[PDB]
Design a protein around this ligand. Structure first.
Ligand SMILES: CCCCCCCCCCCCCCCC(=O)OCC(O)COP(=O)([O-])OC[C@@H](O)CO
Length: 67
């Protein structure tokens, strides 16, 4: 299922713009199909939709979706 809480391993990058860890990027790579659903989360979606989250994808070499 797509639960935002799955992104905890990337929280520093999403919340602060920190360079993402390798483990973060590997988790993001696996979980790409959830990204537009994560972006709709009422609690965390504001962070998921942010520039820091987008920058995290790009730092990980992943496409930024058009949700
Ligand atoms: C690290 C992963 C990043 C993934 C990035 C995906 C790129 C996101 C691009 C823009 C996304 C737009 C998606 C639609 C977001 C939206 O606003 O609709 C959401 C929605 O209907 C569900 O909840 P919500 O209304 O966002 O709730 C927000 C808030 O007010 C509740 O606290």
């Amino acid at each position: 299922a797509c639960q935002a809480s799955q992104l905890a391993v990337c929280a520093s990058a999403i919340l602060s713009g920190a360079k993402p860890s390798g483990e973060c990027c590997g988790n993001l790579r696996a979980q790409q199909g959830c990204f537009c659903q994560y972006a709709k989360d009422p609690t965390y979606g504001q962070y998921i939709r942010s520039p820091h989250a987008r920058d995290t994808l790009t730092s990980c070499g992943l496409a930024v979706p058009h949700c």
